[PDB]
Enzyme design. Structure first.
Site, PDB file in Angstrom:
ATOM      1  N   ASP A 110      46.376  46.005  40.669  1.00 54.80           N
ATOM      2  CA  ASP A 110      45.701  45.204  41.665  1.00 54.80           C
ATOM      3  C   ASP A 110      46.730  44.325  42.373  1.00 54.80           C
ATOM      4  O   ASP A 110      47.931  44.403  42.105  1.00 54.80           O
ATOM      5  CB  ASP A 110      44.535  44.415  41.049  1.00 54.80           C
ATOM      6  CG  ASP A 110      44.965  43.357  40.053  1.00 54.80           C
ATOM      7  OD1 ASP A 110      46.125  43.365  39.606  1.00 54.80           O
ATOM      8  OD2 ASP A 110      44.099  42.507  39.719  1.00 54.80           O
ATOM      9  N   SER A 125      43.392  38.211  44.116  1.00 54.48           N
ATOM     10  CA  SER A 125      43.453  39.414  43.299  1.00 54.48           C
ATOM     11  C   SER A 125      43.097  40.662  44.100  1.00 54.48           C
ATOM     12  O   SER A 125      43.987  41.279  44.695  1.00 54.48           O
ATOM     13  CB  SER A 125      42.540  39.279  42.083  1.00 54.48           C
ATOM     14  OG  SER A 125      42.867  40.282  41.149  1.00 54.48           O
ATOM     15  N   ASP A 174      48.021  41.593  37.655  1.00 51.39           N
ATOM     16  CA  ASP A 174      47.702  41.346  36.252  1.00 51.39           C
ATOM     17  C   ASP A 174      46.844  42.451  35.652  1.00 51.39           C
ATOM     18  O   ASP A 174      46.606  42.430  34.444  1.00 51.39           O
ATOM     19  CB  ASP A 174      47.032  39.977  36.034  1.00 51.39           C
ATOM     20  CG  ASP A 174      45.826  39.739  36.929  1.00 51.39           C
ATOM     21  OD1 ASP A 174      45.455  40.602  37.754  1.00 51.39           O
ATOM     22  OD2 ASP A 174      45.237  38.643  36.791  1.00 51.39           O
TER      23      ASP A 174
HETATM   24 MG   LIG Z   1      44.271  40.509  39.381  1.00 54.37          MG
END
Ligand SMILES: [Mg+2]
Ligand SMILES: O=P(O)(O)OC[C@H]1O[C@H](O)[C@H](O)[C@@H](O)[C@@H]1O
Length: 448
Positions: free
Chosen positions: A237, A97, A241
């Protein structure tokens, strides 16, 4: 001890000491024993080590007799979407992430992209992996490459009435993560003019790790909006998401206010539906949902709680102030793409700027923003706060930490489930002075 990479919600650690190909292969083996029947969807983000970690996962899964559906370089939401759409037994997204480029990780889901978390299988997998000294077997199942995004793209586009869209000028900032690839595939179907910032996927992250909350990364989107006269800007990011909005003045919009805005946007199409929200910041969402004819549903923070509450309530939308937006039609999953499509439609249809869509709500329910505390004794610090305010007799709620409602102001104070931190959120009924004095008062008590 236990493997540090196994967290409450996902797997994340430094490569190669906390996470490596051997661990990834053992995880594939253990995952196979946890899932119902079916194939397993695998995807990965732009990080340099992610392909090799996915390959190791696939090798373990296929040694355990699982067919693998490789959807390639993608966002986390594409693993969720394809896992549900293809009626797979489960899916893994290889991603860290927003962490440094030497970190990586995995997000694991089972059927219908239902989360696998610490208490729902992930620590079971950890313990299995920890004790697995078996020789790696050889594959007894195949891998299929399925990179076609057509169904995913059509699903995204289904949230908006294309004929009502205006040719807005939108800054998009992938942060050299993966979002630009989806933007570019959507663009032929949209009237917008895109201003592309940090657009090319690059796991070396030459412009900073993809975290639009870092002020230096935030300012790149803000500057591009102002310098180009854009209607608004969107940043993501790395695995996109999470989405982050900037109005036409370059101002970053606090994620709290997007929950109420998206809920009203959704409830226009889905009258009377339920909307799930977290307990951190609440008053504006409750009011906007109710005024749009919907029913607000308080829920513990965290995607696993939000999604299960949405499922049990048939809720049409859920949102957290932490930039996560969940959609029933999207397999109850979060998307960083659907939100900006809905906002672009709302701006197009209403003739109002993003700034003005949120201005009055921000004035009516000003909030502190989330303030984090690393203290020597979190439990004693929370107790100091609660003791100080006890004589005012706040209405107390323990859905997620402590929520205390004093009438014209409230706060939520909770331990994080992703870091060893306390998180504070304060809001007031249209009173910026009260917001600042109470926020500073709580902050002093926490640091005492
Ligand atoms: Mg993320
Ligand atoms: O505030 P925390 O407990 O640290 O959680 C912050 C966020 O962590 C992850 O991103 C989860 O997917 C989110 O659902 C959650 O809101």
């Amino acid at each position: 001890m236990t493997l540090p990479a196994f967290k409450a919600y996902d797997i994340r650690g430094r490569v190669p000491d906390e996470l490596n190909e051997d661990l990834a292969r053992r995880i594939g083996v253990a995952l196979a024993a946890q899932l119902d029947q079916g194939p397993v969807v695998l995807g990965h983000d732009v990080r340099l080590a992610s392909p090799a970690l996915q390959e190791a996962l696939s090798a373990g899964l296929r040694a355990s007799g699982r067919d693998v559906i490789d959807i390639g370089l993608c966002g986390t939401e594409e693993v969720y979407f394809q896992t549900d759409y293809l009626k797979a037994a489960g899916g893994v997204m290889v991603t860290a992430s927003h962490n440094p480029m030497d970190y990586n990780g995995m997000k694991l889901v089972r059927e219908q992209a239902r989360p696998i978390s610490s208490d729902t299988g992930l620590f079971a997998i950890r313990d299995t992996v920890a004790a697995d000294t078996a020789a790696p077997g050889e594959p007894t199942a195949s891998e299929q490459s399925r990179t076609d995004k057509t169904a995913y793209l059509e699903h995204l586009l289904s949230y908006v009435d294309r004929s009502t869209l205006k040719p807005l000028k939108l800054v998009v900032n992938a942060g050299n993560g993966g979002a630009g690839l989806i933007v570019d595939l959507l663009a032929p179907h949209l009237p917008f003019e895109f201003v592309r910032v940090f657009h090319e996927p690059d796991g070396n992250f030459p412009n900073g790790i993809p975290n639009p909350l870092l002020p230096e990364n935030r300012d790149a989107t803000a500057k591009a909006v102002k310098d180009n006269g854009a209607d608004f800007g969107i940043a993501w990011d790395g695995d996109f998401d999470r989405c982050f909005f900037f109005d036409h003045t370059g101002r970053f919009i606090e994620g709290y206010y997007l929950v109420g805005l998206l809920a009203q946007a959704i409830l226009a199409k889905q009258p009377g539906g339920k909307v799930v929200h977290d307990p951190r910041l609440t008053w504006n969402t409750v009011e906007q949902v109710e005024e749009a004819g919907g029913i607000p549903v308080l829920c513990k923070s965290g995607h696993a709680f939000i999604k299960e509450k949405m499922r049990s309530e048939n809720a049409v939308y859920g949102g957290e102030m932490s930039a996560h937006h969940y959609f029933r039609e999207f397999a109850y999953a979060d998307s960083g793409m659907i939100p900006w499509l809905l906002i672009a439609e709302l701006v197009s249809q209403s003739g109002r700027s993003l700034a003005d869509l949120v201005e009055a709500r921000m004035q009516k329910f000003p909030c502190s923003g989330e303030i984090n505390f690393k203290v020597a004794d979190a439990k004693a610090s929370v107790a100091r706060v609660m003791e100080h305010y006890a004589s005012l007799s706040p209405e107390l709620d323990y859905t997620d930490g402590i929520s205390a409602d004093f009438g014209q102001w409230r706060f939520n104070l909770r331990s994080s489930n992703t870091e060893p931190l306390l998180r504070l959120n304060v809001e007031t009924r249209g009173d910026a002075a009260l917001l600042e004095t109470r926020t500073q008062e709580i902050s002093n008590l926490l640091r005492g």
